[PDB]
CSV table of C-alpha atoms (C1' of nucleotides) and ligand atoms in Angstrom, one decimal:
chain,number,residue,atom,x,y,z
Z,50,UNK,CA,-17.4,-13.0,-0.4
Z,51,UNK,CA,-17.8,-9.9,1.5
Z,52,UNK,CA,-14.9,-9.2,3.9
Z,53,UNK,CA,-16.4,-7.9,7.2
Z,54,UNK,CA,-15.9,-4.3,8.5
Z,55,UNK,CA,-13.5,-4.4,11.5
Z,56,UNK,CA,-12.8,-2.0,14.4
Z,57,UNK,CA,-9.5,-1.2,12.7
Z,58,UNK,CA,-11.0,0.5,9.6
Z,59,UNK,CA,-8.7,-0.8,6.9
Z,60,UNK,CA,-9.3,1.0,3.7
Z,61,UNK,CA,-9.2,-2.4,2.0
Z,62,UNK,CA,-12.6,-3.1,3.6
Z,63,UNK,CA,-14.3,-0.5,1.3
Z,64,UNK,CA,-12.3,-1.1,-1.9
Z,65,UNK,CA,-12.6,-4.9,-2.3
Z,66,UNK,CA,-15.2,-4.7,-5.1
Z,67,UNK,CA,-12.6,-3.3,-7.5
Z,68,UNK,CA,-9.3,-5.2,-7.2
Z,69,UNK,CA,-7.4,-2.6,-9.2
Z,70,UNK,CA,-8.5,0.1,-6.8
Z,71,UNK,CA,-7.7,-2.0,-3.7
Z,72,UNK,CA,-4.2,-2.7,-5.2
Z,73,UNK,CA,-3.6,0.9,-6.0
Z,74,UNK,CA,-4.5,1.7,-2.4
Z,75,UNK,CA,-1.9,-0.8,-1.1
Z,76,UNK,CA,0.7,1.1,-3.3
Z,77,UNK,CA,-0.4,4.4,-1.9
Z,78,UNK,CA,0.1,2.9,1.6
Z,79,UNK,CA,3.7,1.8,1.0
Z,80,UNK,CA,5.6,3.4,3.9
Z,81,UNK,CA,3.0,6.3,3.9
Z,82,UNK,CA,0.3,6.9,6.6
Z,83,UNK,CA,-3.3,6.3,5.6
Z,84,UNK,CA,-4.2,9.8,7.1
Z,85,UNK,CA,-2.2,11.3,4.2
Z,86,UNK,CA,-2.4,8.8,1.5
Z,87,UNK,CA,-6.2,8.1,1.5
Z,88,UNK,CA,-7.3,11.6,0.7
Z,89,UNK,CA,-4.8,11.7,-2.2
Z,90,UNK,CA,-6.1,8.4,-3.3
Z,91,UNK,CA,-9.6,9.8,-4.0
Z,92,UNK,CA,-8.1,12.6,-6.1
Z,93,UNK,CA,-6.0,10.0,-8.0
Z,94,UNK,CA,-9.1,7.9,-8.7
Z,95,UNK,CA,-11.1,10.8,-10.0
Z,96,UNK,CA,-8.4,11.5,-12.6
Z,97,UNK,CA,-7.5,7.9,-13.3
Z,98,UNK,CA,-10.7,5.9,-12.6
Z,99,UNK,CA,-9.5,2.6,-14.0
Z,100,UNK,CA,-6.4,0.7,-15.0
Z,101,UNK,CA,-7.3,1.5,-18.6
Z,102,UNK,CA,-6.7,5.3,-17.9
Z,103,UNK,CA,-3.7,4.8,-15.6
Z,104,UNK,CA,-1.9,2.6,-18.2
Z,105,UNK,CA,-1.9,5.5,-20.6
Z,106,UNK,CA,-0.8,8.2,-18.2
Z,107,UNK,CA,2.5,10.1,-18.2
Z,108,UNK,CA,4.1,9.1,-14.9
Z,109,UNK,CA,5.5,12.7,-14.5
Z,110,UNK,CA,1.9,13.9,-14.2
Z,111,UNK,CA,1.0,11.2,-11.7
Z,112,UNK,CA,4.1,12.1,-9.8
Z,113,UNK,CA,2.9,15.7,-9.3
Z,114,UNK,CA,-0.2,14.4,-7.6
Z,115,UNK,CA,1.8,12.0,-5.4
Z,116,UNK,CA,4.4,14.6,-4.4
Z,117,UNK,CA,3.2,15.3,-0.8
Z,118,UNK,CA,3.2,11.5,-0.1
Z,119,UNK,CA,6.8,11.0,-0.9
Z,120,UNK,CA,8.1,8.1,-3.1
Z,121,UNK,CA,6.4,10.1,-5.9
Z,122,UNK,CA,8.5,9.3,-9.0
Z,123,UNK,CA,8.9,5.7,-7.8
Z,124,UNK,CA,5.2,5.1,-7.3
Z,125,UNK,CA,4.1,7.1,-10.3
Z,126,UNK,CA,6.2,4.8,-12.5
Z,127,UNK,CA,4.9,1.8,-10.6
Z,128,UNK,CA,1.3,2.8,-11.0
Z,129,UNK,CA,1.5,3.1,-14.8
Z,130,UNK,CA,3.4,-0.2,-15.2
Z,131,UNK,CA,1.3,-2.1,-12.7
Z,132,UNK,CA,-1.8,-0.9,-14.4
Z,133,UNK,CA,-0.5,-2.0,-17.8
Z,134,UNK,CA,0.3,-5.4,-16.5
Z,135,UNK,CA,-2.9,-5.8,-14.6
Z,136,UNK,CA,-4.8,-5.5,-17.9
Z,137,UNK,CA,-2.4,-7.1,-20.4
Z,138,UNK,CA,-0.3,-9.8,-18.6
Z,139,UNK,CA,-1.7,-13.2,-17.6
Z,140,UNK,CA,-1.8,-13.5,-13.8
Z,141,UNK,CA,-3.5,-15.5,-11.1
Z,142,UNK,CA,-2.3,-13.5,-8.1
Z,143,UNK,CA,-1.2,-9.9,-8.2
Z,144,UNK,CA,2.2,-10.5,-6.7
Z,145,UNK,CA,3.0,-11.6,-10.2
Z,146,UNK,CA,2.6,-7.9,-11.2
Z,147,UNK,CA,5.2,-5.1,-11.0
Z,148,UNK,CA,4.7,-3.1,-7.8
Z,149,UNK,CA,2.7,-5.6,-5.8
Z,150,UNK,CA,4.6,-7.7,-3.1
Z,151,UNK,CA,3.5,-9.8,-0.2
Z,152,UNK,CA,1.6,-7.0,1.5
Z,153,UNK,CA,-0.5,-6.2,-1.6
Z,154,UNK,CA,-0.9,-9.8,-2.4
Z,155,UNK,CA,-2.0,-10.8,1.1
Z,156,UNK,CA,-4.5,-7.8,1.0
Z,157,UNK,CA,-5.9,-9.2,-2.3
Z,158,UNK,CA,-6.2,-12.7,-0.9
Z,159,UNK,CA,-8.0,-11.5,2.3
Z,160,UNK,CA,-10.3,-9.0,0.6
Z,161,UNK,CA,-10.9,-9.7,-3.1
Z,162,UNK,CA,-11.1,-13.5,-3.0
Z,163,UNK,CA,-12.1,-15.8,-0.2
Z,164,UNK,CA,-8.6,-17.0,0.8
Z,165,UNK,CA,-8.2,-15.3,4.1
Z,166,UNK,CA,-7.8,-18.7,6.0
Z,167,UNK,CA,-4.7,-19.5,3.8
Z,168,UNK,CA,-3.0,-16.1,4.3
Z,169,UNK,CA,-0.2,-15.5,6.8
Z,170,UNK,CA,0.4,-11.8,6.8
Z,171,UNK,CA,3.6,-10.0,8.0
Z,172,UNK,CA,2.1,-6.5,7.9
Z,173,UNK,CA,1.0,-5.2,11.3
Z,174,UNK,CA,-2.3,-3.7,10.2
Z,175,UNK,CA,-3.3,-6.7,8.1
Z,176,UNK,CA,-2.4,-9.0,11.0
Z,177,UNK,CA,-4.7,-7.0,13.3
Z,178,UNK,CA,-7.5,-7.6,10.7
Z,179,UNK,CA,-6.6,-11.2,10.0
Z,180,UNK,CA,-6.3,-12.1,13.7
Z,181,UNK,CA,-9.6,-10.5,14.4
Z,182,UNK,CA,-11.2,-12.4,11.6
Z,183,UNK,CA,-10.1,-15.8,13.1
Z,184,UNK,CA,-11.4,-14.6,16.4
Z,185,UNK,CA,-14.8,-13.5,15.1
Z,186,UNK,CA,-15.7,-15.4,12.0
Z,187,UNK,CA,-17.9,-17.9,13.9
Z,188,UNK,CA,-19.9,-14.9,15.4
Z,189,UNK,CA,-20.1,-13.4,11.9
Z,190,UNK,CA,-21.1,-16.7,10.3
Z,191,UNK,CA,-18.1,-17.0,8.0
Q,1,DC,C1',13.0,22.5,16.9
Q,2,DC,C1',14.0,17.7,14.8
Q,3,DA,C1',14.7,12.3,14.6
Q,4,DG,C1',11.7,8.8,13.6
Q,5,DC,C1',8.1,6.9,11.0
Q,6,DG,C1',4.0,5.4,8.1
Q,7,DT,C1',-0.9,-0.8,6.3
Q,8,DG,C1',6.7,-1.6,0.8
Q,9,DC,C1',8.8,-2.8,-3.1
Q,10,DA,C1',12.2,-3.7,-6.8
Q,11,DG,C1',16.8,-4.0,-8.0
Q,12,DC,C1',20.8,-5.5,-6.8
X,1,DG,C1',20.8,-10.0,2.6
X,2,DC,C1',21.0,-4.4,1.7
X,3,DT,C1',19.7,0.1,-0.3
X,4,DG,C1',17.2,4.0,-2.7
X,5,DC,C1',13.1,6.0,-2.8
X,6,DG,C1',10.7,10.5,0.2
X,7,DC,C1',7.0,13.4,1.9
X,8,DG,C1',4.3,15.4,5.9
X,9,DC,C1',3.1,13.8,10.2
X,10,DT,C1',4.2,13.0,14.9
X,11,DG,C1',5.5,14.0,19.5
X,12,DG,C1',9.4,14.7,22.7
H,201,MG,MG1,5.3,-8.2,-7.8
DNA sequence: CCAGCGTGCAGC
DNA sequence: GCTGCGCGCTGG
C-alpha cells in the first residue's frame, strides 16, 4: 500500500513508510501550521531519529526545540510518553496510545495501512485528501 | 498594530 | 460537554 500523492501536499504522504514518524508529524501539527511545524520536524528527527531515542529523552530538552511552535511542554511530554508506549505497549491502532486521537489515528489508517475506505475523517485537511481519494482511486487503479 | 488561527489532545 | 496548552503566522 502506497498512498498516492495529492494536489494538497499532506506531509503524511511522504512519511507513511515509518509510522512513528508519521504519528510524530501529526503531533507537531496539533493546532500548529505545517509551514512552521514541518521545518522543526526535520530538526527534531535528526536529534531523535526513532522512538527508541525519543523514549529516553528529557522532555525539557525536547521542549526547547518545540518552543517556537507553542504547546511546547505539553507536546514534549507527549512525545516522550507516546514513543515509550509505541514500543512497549500492545496496540493495534495508535489511538490506543497517549497523544494520538482520532486525527492521528485516521492519518495512520489512511496512510500506513490500507484502511482508507473505512475511515471517516473530521479533520479538514484529511477530508480534502480522503474525498479526493474516493474521486480518483479508479483513475489511479486503487 | 492586533484578534484570530493552525492538518488536537488529554484531563476533567 | 469544557478547558489548558501556546507559539509565530496571517491579514485587516
Ligand atoms: Mg490516544
